[PDB]
Amino acid sequence: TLAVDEIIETISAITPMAQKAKKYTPPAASMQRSSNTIWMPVEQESPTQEGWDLTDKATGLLELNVAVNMGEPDNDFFQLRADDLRDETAYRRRIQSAARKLANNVELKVANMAAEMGSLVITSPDAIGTNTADAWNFVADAEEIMFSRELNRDMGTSYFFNPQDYKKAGYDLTKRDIFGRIPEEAYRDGTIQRQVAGFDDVLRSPKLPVLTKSTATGITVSGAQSFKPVAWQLDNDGNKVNVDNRFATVTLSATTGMKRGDKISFAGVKFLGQMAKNVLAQDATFSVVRVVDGTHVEITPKPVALDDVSLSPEQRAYANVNTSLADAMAVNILNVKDARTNVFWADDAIRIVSQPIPANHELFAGMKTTSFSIPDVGLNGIFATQGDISTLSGLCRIALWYGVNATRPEAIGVGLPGQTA
Template sequence: MTFWKRRGQVAGRQQATELNKSIAQLVNTSGSMYYESNAASGFDFISEGQALMNERQGLKTDRCYILNDRSTQKFGTDLAGRQTLQGRPADTWTTGQIGSNIAEFDVYTGSFLPQVAASSGSTTTTATFSGKPEGGGVSASFIVTNVDYRTADIAVTASAGFAVGDKVTFSNVNAVGLADKTDTGILMTFTVVGIPNGTSVTIFPKPIALGDAGLNITEKAYANVNTQIVSGATMGAVNTTGGRSNLFYDNDAIEVLGGDVPMQLMGEFDGMKVISETMSNGLNMYMVYDSRLDDLRLRYRLFTWYGLTAKDPSRMGVSVSI
């Protein structure tokens, strides 16, 4: 029984690893915040993410910062050599970890973080974009229509120089604080999530401009940029160097949707047995197994169902240490 218990534990860890990889890939390709930094100090590097998130004034719950192994080594070396922080240098010497609650983040290390491809993409827009908040609707015949409020299609001269996952800015379009609409003075970053054709790109999040005269006062309450993307504006990629990613996000920005299936019905067929357990991440894991008396073979399968969505890409970001 110890052997099978260990096999189950290994399978569970592997499924958790796959979930971590899926979340990392989602943040890498969907997160709208981005910066590249050559800071040698872990605090300087991580606090840039804090500044971006605080300036944009998004909903704050629990924040995570996941460093790749090389970034952890770089910043851990800096911390381990310090003598001014009580206890933390010694902890870093022992564990190689930087610690928790740094610049409002719980900091982790992940070997599963993806690469950020370098991009030199640049183009110009061919139309002024006016975006407003949208929701779903219900028709008179009770047909529900859902609207993806996160995306915007931007008309450009040519989209060939860009790829899904590129982080881009538009000239003169700055991020504003969601609560008080203060202009941060920092260009708003967007992520390319689709390339419908050769003359348009789809970006996260939808730019809603405080200075858009076509919006009413209620719609302007959702503004995330100071001014509209106008025709002739320069659109350029900011992931110019690329490299191994580090990820930061608010936990509430990502939704993990678990699935339930009536696997207990398998017990009605050919002597199969079914057990299930809720894992620490809230997902259900199922184990279906059976055996043969004539050759003492035991067969089993472990599995879980889940889906991911970037509920709020404006509270997800990517960084690269260069």
């Protein structure tokens, strides 16, 4: 038998979301002490009154903030053996497979975080090939909701299709019985266009997660709840601890069947215009971030109500919903069928905090540590090797430390087609 070192190449992936997301590397010395979390302010909103005599009505100031932290390292620990001749040729390729696997894992984390924390939800009652220009309508709905909410889109916007719906869009384009330039491009290649319905980058991402249907039914808000913007609160010892602005814990009748990433919407509340505080016609949509306890959940866009009377004016300045929760309103579920998601966002809503692993120190003498660039994505990890006490063997560890943070869940979105039944 003759093995012949002629590699039968078999796989080839891509990491568009991870190579597109912004990356942040805060100072390691301060992030060690600050428990691997840092705080970033949010753009300020000003209350406004009109009149002539404004005595005793001078508002204060209030600036909210969000917290970005990090997860755990993703390693490729493996054991290298000399005196094998099969661990001599396999190791050289194991390093490369490790690099590709780590890049893919980073992209998977990015896609999952975006899909399970995208507040804006665009649901459709049928598939994409049902009507003509239906994929265009699907993208334009997302663009319209971003525009109406008046979210910051200076950095850019992006829409990610899955292969199924991208192919459906291309088929819709080619079926037109007319060939200009766009139909000919969608014929020769599968591309619809690089920009569709106003988005600055419309791609297809093969690793988009599937949002399974929610078996939560007959659920109502349990008691009136008012959520107030705040920037810190007093702890038991009298200290002031900052407060994350992108979460709100609601008390429901029963949180059975809910899970992380469920898209919900209360009956009666509507989106606002943020800046102008004009009531939209859309139902305000929220995303379940955590199922805490059995009658509480944690939804990501904090529902600051416009008509709340317990809100001081500088707090009411941040209102993004027309009406608060009314102690019996039905919480409708938006993901009623299993559907692989199409994900849109503003380009500055996901960041990938990164840290180093200082294994080049004098402390880690005896193990040889070098830098290791993860391809495609812009990340750097460590590659460390150390031999064994005897037996002519070794150990290799490829490590990478990062954390995927969604600083603007209200700017991340999700598209759910075929939401009938």
